[PDB]
Amino acid sequence: GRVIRNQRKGAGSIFTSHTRLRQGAAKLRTLDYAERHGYIRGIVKQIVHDSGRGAPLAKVVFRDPYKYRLREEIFIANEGVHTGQFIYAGKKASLNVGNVLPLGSVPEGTIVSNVEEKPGDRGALARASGNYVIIIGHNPDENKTRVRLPSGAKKVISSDARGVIGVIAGGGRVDKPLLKAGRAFHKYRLKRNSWPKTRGVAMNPVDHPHGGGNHQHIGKASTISRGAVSGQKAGLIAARRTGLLRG
RNA sequence: UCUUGGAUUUAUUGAAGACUAACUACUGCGAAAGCAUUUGCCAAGGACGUUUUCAUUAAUCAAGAACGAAAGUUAGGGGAU
RNA sequence: CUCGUAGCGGUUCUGACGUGCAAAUCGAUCGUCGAAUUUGGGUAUAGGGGCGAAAGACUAAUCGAACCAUCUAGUAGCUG
RNA sequence: UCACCUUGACCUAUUCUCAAACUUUAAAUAUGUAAGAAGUCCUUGUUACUUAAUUGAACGUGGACAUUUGAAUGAAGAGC
RNA sequence: UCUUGGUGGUAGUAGCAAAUAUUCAAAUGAGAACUUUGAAGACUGAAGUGGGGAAAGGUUCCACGUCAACAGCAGUUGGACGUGGGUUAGUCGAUCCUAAGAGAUGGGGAAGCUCCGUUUCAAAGGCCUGAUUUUAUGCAGGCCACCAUCGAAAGGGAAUCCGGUUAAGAUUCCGGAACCUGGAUAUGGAUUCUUCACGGUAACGUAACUGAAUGUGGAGACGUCGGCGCGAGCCCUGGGAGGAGUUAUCUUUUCUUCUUAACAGCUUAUCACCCCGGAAUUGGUUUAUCCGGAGAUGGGGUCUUAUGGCUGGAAGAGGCCAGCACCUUUGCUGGCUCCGGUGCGCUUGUGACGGCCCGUGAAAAUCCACAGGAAGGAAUAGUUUUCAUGCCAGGUCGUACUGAUAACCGCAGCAGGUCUCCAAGGUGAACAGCCUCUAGUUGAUAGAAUAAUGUAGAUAAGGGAAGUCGGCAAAAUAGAUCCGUAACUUCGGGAUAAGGAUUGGCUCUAAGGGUCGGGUACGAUCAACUUAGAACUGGUACGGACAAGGGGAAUCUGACUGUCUAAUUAAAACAUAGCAUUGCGAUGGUCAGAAAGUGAUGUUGACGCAAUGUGAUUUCUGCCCAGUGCUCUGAAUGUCAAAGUGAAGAAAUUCAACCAAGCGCGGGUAAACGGCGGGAGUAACUAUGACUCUCUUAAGGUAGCCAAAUGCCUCGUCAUCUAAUUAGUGACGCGCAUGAAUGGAUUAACGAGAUUCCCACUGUCCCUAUCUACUAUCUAGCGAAACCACAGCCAAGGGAACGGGCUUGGCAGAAUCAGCGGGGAAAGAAGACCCUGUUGAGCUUGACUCUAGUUUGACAUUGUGAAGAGACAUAGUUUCUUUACUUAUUCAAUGAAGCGGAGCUGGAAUUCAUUUUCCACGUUCUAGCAUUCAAGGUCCCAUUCGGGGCUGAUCCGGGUUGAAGACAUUGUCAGGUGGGGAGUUUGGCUGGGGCGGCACAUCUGUUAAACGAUAACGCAGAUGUCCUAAGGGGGGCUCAUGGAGAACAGAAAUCUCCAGUAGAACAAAAGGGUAAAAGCCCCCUUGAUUUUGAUUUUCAGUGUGAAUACAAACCAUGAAAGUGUGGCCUAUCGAUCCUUUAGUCCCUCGGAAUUUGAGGCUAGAGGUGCCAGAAAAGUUACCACAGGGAUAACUGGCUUGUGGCAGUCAAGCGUUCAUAGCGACAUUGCUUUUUGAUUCUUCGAUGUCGGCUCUUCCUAUCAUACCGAAGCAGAAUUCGGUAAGCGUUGGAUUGUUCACCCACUAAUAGGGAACGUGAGCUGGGUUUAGACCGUCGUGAGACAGGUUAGUUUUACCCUACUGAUGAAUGUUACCGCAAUAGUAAUUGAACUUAGUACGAGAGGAACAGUUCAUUCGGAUAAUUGGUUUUUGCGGCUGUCUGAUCAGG
Ligand SMILES: [Mg+2]
Ligand SMILES: [Mg+2]
Ligand SMILES: [Mg+2]
Ligand SMILES: [Mg+2]
Ligand SMILES: [Mg+2]
Ligand SMILES: [Mg+2]
Ligand SMILES: [Mg+2]
Ligand SMILES: [Mg+2]
Ligand SMILES: [Mg+2]
Ligand SMILES: [Mg+2]
Ligand SMILES: [Mg+2]
Ligand SMILES: [Mg+2]
Ligand SMILES: [Mg+2]
Ligand SMILES: [Mg+2]
Ligand SMILES: [Mg+2]
Ligand SMILES: [Mg+2]
Ligand SMILES: [Mg+2]
Ligand SMILES: [Mg+2]
Ligand SMILES: [Mg+2]
Ligand SMILES: [Mg+2]
Ligand SMILES: [Mg+2]
Ligand SMILES: [Mg+2]
Ligand SMILES: [Mg+2]
Ligand SMILES: [Mg+2]
Ligand SMILES: [Mg+2]
Ligand SMILES: [Mg+2]
Ligand SMILES: [Mg+2]
Ligand SMILES: [Mg+2]
Ligand SMILES: [Mg+2]
Ligand SMILES: [Mg+2]
Ligand SMILES: [Mg+2]
Ligand SMILES: [Mg+2]
Ligand SMILES: [Mg+2]
Ligand SMILES: [Mg+2]
Ligand SMILES: [Mg+2]
Ligand SMILES: [Mg+2]
Ligand SMILES: [Mg+2]
Ligand SMILES: [Mg+2]
Ligand SMILES: [Mg+2]
Ligand SMILES: [Mg+2]
Ligand SMILES: [Mg+2]
Ligand SMILES: [Mg+2]
Ligand SMILES: [Mg+2]
Ligand SMILES: [Mg+2]
Ligand SMILES: [Mg+2]
Ligand SMILES: [Mg+2]
Ligand SMILES: [Mg+2]
Ligand SMILES: [Mg+2]
Ligand SMILES: [Mg+2]
Ligand SMILES: [Mg+2]
Ligand SMILES: [Mg+2]
Ligand SMILES: [Mg+2]
Ligand SMILES: [Mg+2]
Ligand SMILES: [Mg+2]
Ligand SMILES: [Mg+2]
Ligand SMILES: [Mg+2]
Ligand SMILES: [Mg+2]
Ligand SMILES: [Mg+2]
Ligand SMILES: [Mg+2]
Ligand SMILES: [Mg+2]
Ligand SMILES: [Mg+2]
Ligand SMILES: [Mg+2]
Ligand SMILES: [Mg+2]
Ligand SMILES: [Mg+2]
Ligand SMILES: [Mg+2]
Ligand SMILES: [Mg+2]
Ligand SMILES: [Mg+2]
Ligand SMILES: [Mg+2]
Ligand SMILES: [Mg+2]
Ligand SMILES: [Mg+2]
Ligand SMILES: [Mg+2]
Ligand SMILES: [Mg+2]
Ligand SMILES: [Mg+2]
Ligand SMILES: [Mg+2]
Ligand SMILES: [Mg+2]
Ligand SMILES: [Mg+2]
Ligand SMILES: [Mg+2]
Ligand SMILES: [Mg+2]
Ligand SMILES: [Mg+2]
Ligand SMILES: [Mg+2]
Ligand SMILES: [Mg+2]
Ligand SMILES: [Mg+2]
Ligand SMILES: [Mg+2]
Ligand SMILES: [Mg+2]
Ligand SMILES: [Mg+2]
Ligand SMILES: [Mg+2]
Ligand SMILES: [Mg+2]
Ligand SMILES: [Mg+2]
Ligand SMILES: [Mg+2]
Ligand SMILES: [Mg+2]
Ligand SMILES: [Mg+2]
Ligand SMILES: [Mg+2]
Ligand SMILES: [Mg+2]
Ligand SMILES: [Mg+2]
Ligand SMILES: [Mg+2]
């Protein structure tokens, strides 16, 4: 008869993002006349590390078209982008790694990252370390493009949506083992309070639907409907098949 | 088992990975295991030719090493048959 | 990582004490001691709620549901 | 044996022993009613009941009988 | 156990015992253990008992006066009491900045208190003018796109130091010496006829050396560890100038002073950089291997000023002395204050590096610089001066003190807790322990004595775990050097494995450094502590105190480090990395919120986030989709709500069709929940059973493992371990009930985890003794509490069954002291177990009823066109179908910046004399720059040295832009889902409750004892039906059965007679009843009918059911008398409310009617079986409350099935012979220690088993003493008597009592004492809360199943006991007596008797006598051992007193 840990996370008290040391919001450059009819030239000045993020951040500096001043955008760095590199964003831009072009104006099989789901929302797809997006199709009348997402799914996005050529840098990170609870401690120190995890079967029945009994056992089926609510969605939510993938 | 929710067939267009028929032989190369679509680059190899050059530098070899079908092992990728 | 101080804990004596020095101490013996360490201040989360490396533990000596006031002189086939 | 010492039960007359859910009989104790005036007797009045029929039935008028008026003991007042 | 207040006994009692410790004298005083001073002894021992601070306190600080209360003794003292004094800032903080966050406004939500949000969807605004005469500087240009405010006395930050001063303030006052900010402002210097400096190749330099808007850059501004370098301070030390100490002797000796601030000038640097040069024969170089043609080495330079040196500050101050004054105002005078060395030292700061990260380690205020060139400006210095000097001001608040064994919190002057800075010498590795210096304290009620029992510390002969549940506690080990070091292993470890030597002192030896140097075959000089070796030496001591690992072989278990039940559970539980599963591509997953123009994840984006499971590595994860969950573009007349449609009706209404989700159907999923079998026969053994035959499966437990922490039986069986093992280990396995991510098996290392063994070791024990300190005791002072009906000597009896009192006995003499744990079923706590309650709570679910949320349908928002297998058959915008518009709505973005359309060219437009037609719009080697309405061009001005347009830069539409679109979304309603959340329910009787049953509503016979009534979970049975006849009537007939007779035919077919009192039948149990019937056969029928009363039984003379007699009818029936109101009689059944039906066509619908419709009256039905009648699933070991001995266990008491022990009788056994010794079939008793029955007492609690310890009692006698009997020759036995005097063991396993074995013994008898004995212990067993396993349940949970951990309180009161005093007897003293009470010894062996008696032999005694021993007891200390504060003597370490001696 007590609210469970998965419910308490939505109140957002001790379960927020530890966001002091982060370098900003890693977004694309705001879609304007420079990036819609020609291009604009940037410059990388730093490849910095983002706290809580496994991918480096490239600080790319552009000139403001309308006022004499410099605008520093923060990109997710692509593997191969270096400091001192000129970076081109726009429609008429050239395909190099780190250039920002619409999905329509890049050919089939192009490998892109920081890809907008809608034109101008400043980067939503292929942002974690190592991941990328492959363009697998085009429908030039009623401009759309078919992609493969990092999950393996197929998405249809506007051809006016943008992307950055290359993979997101920092790949192969999760292939290293953490080896100890300490290295898990400092990974989640700079993300959010989701660590450690107590098993619900290791509890009292007031705390979890899995807890209690004279032996640690689940009692009911762990697969719960999508048509259930909070407090019952403690287990496998809306599972199609369970266990190993052996047919 | 699939099938009137149109299977099987047929046509158009795509993807994926694998494979490289026919030509293909009492034919070739490779130390052996093995090796076939093209073009490019890389270093190599046999045989021939030689009025070149060195002039026994060689033969086989314990111990020791390189390579070693396929299945298998570990971890990524890929999963068309 | 280890031996071991400061520190931080609390194994055993089932030691002392048990109208105590103390509503949890004292002593010896112990765990650990460069990190998932220890800690001050600021700050956030509030009661059927929080918080929980999970013991129904902790949330002002109060916790299988805090504390305060009211409804309330709640009701009692039960005891005085 | 192919009417026989070595037949079983059955029938008839005997015999020993018994019965809470057997009995011809049958106590003790306990128990119902009666021992009168709201009585008995005579005459005959009523009725739609009853009879073949004032016959019966029931309730009566009038008349006969007075405390040994219908066993014993008691009664402390009786009844409501 | 009332309330409030007061008061006692206990009681002058318990006690005032941690933190080494006090002592002498004087002073003050009424009074001194405690005050003050001196002396002495000591301690904290620099991670302090020392100097400061943060929080908190608040005056506690300081002085004077004072001692009533407070300082648990005292008090002249005080943190007390009374009166006062005291806190000084431009520089230290606050103030300011932002952090995590908090929070207004605009705006949205909410009935509202108010909520969200912090830049949002807002018309959110101040900044300078170049510089002043029409300026209160605007009535002007020009610029800026953010958007409150709060948030740190530890973060960021402008600037102050030294000396002195107070009773108490100080980085604040005073004296001296600075600095910063803000403002104003003059002079000098600088620069200027080249108008905004010069020098250097350069790095850069300087005293200056204009610089607007705008932009850019830097600082503020950052982790941790390691080593190295450098600095400061400290420590160590040499020479000298003073002062003090010791001085028998020694000591050029021991201690001590010898200082230099902020600020300023000049110099000072690793790193970095510049020039020259051009490198392999590669060089440079760090402790640490980096660097160099992208230019090393080298030679010259440049810069940062951490930091150091010099000088100013500043010797005038501070220190140390000396001399002279000597109520001198109170000083005056004078000298010295100097020069070094050393370093793996300590603390700290810094610099250059290196290591680490799936961790890469704040922000803002603020300040500066540069880019740019706006504007302004030149005479002998026009401007401008970030150069020097000069002037003024710096507010408000805080400041004292403590910061804790007395200033804070803990009730308080509480051994507790509470953040931080500084940190001397020695020993030593050390911030350890031990001793000392500076500083500080010497506070804690005392004195005397040295009983017991304690607490704390010790030691112990011989043995060495025999102790105990268990090695608990203790001992042992310990530092360092050298040697040596296994199994196993994840190859990193194990590991300090195990083991084994050495260690002092003194005198030496040998290595190991720095600075100094060459010709266009060389040693002066200084300094450090490591290491190795040698000799000599000694009561063979030496890590001499201190400090400091015990180790080994196994098993279980968790990989490890880590975490938790504060205050009983530290673990095997939790976590963990690793592994795996699941969901989600943002209009999203998971979750918030009452809503929201609302939130978390999210400053996010599948290498992510969320939800779970398992838990490192090795090696594996078998079989199951039937169940239930989950899931599926799956089947579409099975079910399908609301809305909508249609039919009938006057209509309310009734019906029908259509019918979304969801359910049902089909499938997939087990690292989802979960599951993983019998009977029988078979191999040339007897059973065993590869294979085989069936029953049911979805699958029938695979790989593995095991009496395992999982196995009841079980202490399984074997082996091993031991003398002996219910332990352990290894095997085996039909395994009650093992098993694969509810993970199976194994696994190095780790572990305050659990278990067994071994070595060492020891007082754990045999078996106890001694010592010290503190208590206790006694004294002065001070002085509680628990508890208390009244109390306090027993035996027996009875009694609510264990009496202090009552009864009958025993007896009994003041007042007491120390102990003590028998008793007071002592106290502590209105039992926490069990029961009762129509008492609650928590958690679970296939209980009931809801509910948020979610899903599905409908209507509104919701408009505009189409095509329309979209109306019913010249027939119509809505209709069981799709896509077209944008303006509602929705999403998103931006400083709403470039949208839409139209306009120049050139063509593979082969211009088709037409853009039917389309395409490109100033930027891509490179880490530069991009700003001033834009220069140019053009035209105008009224031209003023400047100003304005246009074009540069196409025109038009004012639609910011992109999606999405009348669908989501939203409002309302309807169906589903919905233990996530809520509330409620879970009967009773009961030889306690649970379970079973119904004795819960009934019937017959018995119980039941001759009217009636009468209990038990008494007994034997039956009831919830059956019947249109098995009801009613009439007539006829006799039934069960037996005997004899009939072909098949018998023992049983039909037929016939005789006998048949019922021995048959009557629906169903049993009892009763019945023979021209009540039965059997036949005929007719519905009385099993209507209406109202009366009555009987159960009984309240209520109801219900059943029944009896009538009466009014109407029928049946029979010839009729009659009979029939269901069954031959005794059982077979049901209220109010609601619904329904029959009847009358009756009453009413209240303004009056008609018609439906509704309501009403009388009689039935539908039902409550718990049967006088609620609508209801579990568990609780987390439980709780009101009670209850109305109630379970332990004890006592009764009873005595059972257990044991006896007896009578004697068929028989005992070679004959009942009774030497036995004894059947019977029979009569005893015990309460075994086990069973009462719930008698106890629930405002009698502390629950075993053990240990210790006492007493019984006798039903094992031994010992003395005897009797024998089938007693002897020896040894057996049976029996008197007898409880005296003994009655040590161990392995087990928590066990019991058991069992080993072994000794004279013997290892049995019992009682609240199953003797917990204020005597222990806590192993059992009995809370943690945890794991097995079985069972969907689960919560359960198990008189296993395993691990889990606080044991109080005596000082009375009595009892043990010891100790004592009034009274004329006083006093010595010597005695003995009533009464207690009593104590015990047992064995050997020699001799004696190889004798006896015996055929084998064997083989006893009495007397001597000598020893066992167990016990009482002493005693010559000896032997133990003990040591004799601190007696000696030795040793470390430190301290200068050394020595002598000591602490
Ligand atoms: Mg976990
Ligand atoms: Mg738990
Ligand atoms: Mg080919
Ligand atoms: Mg460690
Ligand atoms: Mg350790
Ligand atoms: Mg420690
Ligand atoms: Mg503990
Ligand atoms: Mg204790
Ligand atoms: Mg350590
Ligand atoms: Mg601390
Ligand atoms: Mg809640
Ligand atoms: Mg629990
Ligand atoms: Mg409360
Ligand atoms: Mg009350
Ligand atoms: Mg009877
Ligand atoms: Mg009678
Ligand atoms: Mg009192
Ligand atoms: Mg006393
Ligand atoms: Mg004393
Ligand atoms: Mg000391
Ligand atoms: Mg006092
Ligand atoms: Mg006094
Ligand atoms: Mg004072
Ligand atoms: Mg300051
Ligand atoms: Mg502020
Ligand atoms: Mg900081
Ligand atoms: Mg000063
Ligand atoms: Mg001048
Ligand atoms: Mg100059
Ligand atoms: Mg700067
Ligand atoms: Mg200063
Ligand atoms: Mg420090
Ligand atoms: Mg100046
Ligand atoms: Mg002050
Ligand atoms: Mg002060
Ligand atoms: Mg102070
Ligand atoms: Mg005090
Ligand atoms: Mg020292
Ligand atoms: Mg030393
Ligand atoms: Mg003391
Ligand atoms: Mg000894
Ligand atoms: Mg000895
Ligand atoms: Mg023993
Ligand atoms: Mg021990
Ligand atoms: Mg060594
Ligand atoms: Mg060793
Ligand atoms: Mg070992
Ligand atoms: Mg562990
Ligand atoms: Mg575990
Ligand atoms: Mg494991
Ligand atoms: Mg640990
Ligand atoms: Mg605890
Ligand atoms: Mg957020
Ligand atoms: Mg499995
Ligand atoms: Mg409907
Ligand atoms: Mg043992
Ligand atoms: Mg075993
Ligand atoms: Mg075996
Ligand atoms: Mg087994
Ligand atoms: Mg004493
Ligand atoms: Mg009395
Ligand atoms: Mg008597
Ligand atoms: Mg009493
Ligand atoms: Mg009396
Ligand atoms: Mg009497
Ligand atoms: Mg007596
Ligand atoms: Mg006395
Ligand atoms: Mg005592
Ligand atoms: Mg007692
Ligand atoms: Mg008690
Ligand atoms: Mg009741
Ligand atoms: Mg815009
Ligand atoms: Mg009777
Ligand atoms: Mg019967
Ligand atoms: Mg019945
Ligand atoms: Mg008849
Ligand atoms: Mg019958
Ligand atoms: Mg009968
Ligand atoms: Mg009845
Ligand atoms: Mg009712
Ligand atoms: Mg009306
Ligand atoms: Mg009843
Ligand atoms: Mg009571
Ligand atoms: Mg006797
Ligand atoms: Mg005897
Ligand atoms: Mg005898
Ligand atoms: Mg006796
Ligand atoms: Mg005796
Ligand atoms: Mg005995
Ligand atoms: Mg007992
Ligand atoms: Mg006792
Ligand atoms: Mg225990
Ligand atoms: Mg006790
Ligand atoms: Mg006492
Ligand atoms: Mg001596």
- Per-residue buried b or exposed e for A202-241, using 16+ beta carbons within 10 Å of the residue's own CB: ebeeebbbbbbeeeeeeeeebebeeeeeeeebbbeeeeee
Q: Cβ(A78)–Cβ(A167) under 8 Å?
A: yes
Sheet holding A133-139, edge to edge: A70-76, A57-63, A39-48, A86-90, A100-102, A162-165, A111-113, A133-139, A144-148, A154-158
Q: How far apart are CA A142 and CA A28, in angstroms?
A: 24
Cα of A246 vs centre of ligand 56, distance in Å, is 54
Q: How far apart are CA A51 and CA A197, in angstroms?
A: 22
Q: Cβ(A15)–Cβ(A154) under 8 Å?
A: no
Q: How far apart are CA A43 and CA A71, in angstroms?
A: 11
- In the 151-210 segment of chain A, residues within 7 Å (Cβ) of strand C are 180-183, 185-186, 193, 196, 198, 202-208
Residue where the block lists tokens 């999760």: A174
The CA-based angle A239-A241-A247, given to 5 degrees, is 165
Resolution (A): 3.0
Q: How far apart are CA A237 and CA A246, in angstroms?
A: 21
Distance A242 CA to E592 C1' (A): 30
Cα of A100 vs centre of ligand 60, distance in Å, is 96
Spatial neighbors of A153 by CB under 8 A, at least 6 apart, are none
Experimental method: cryo-EM
The CA-based angle A169-A174-A177, given to 5 degrees, is 140
Question: Any atom of strand E under 7 A from CB of A171?
Answer: yes
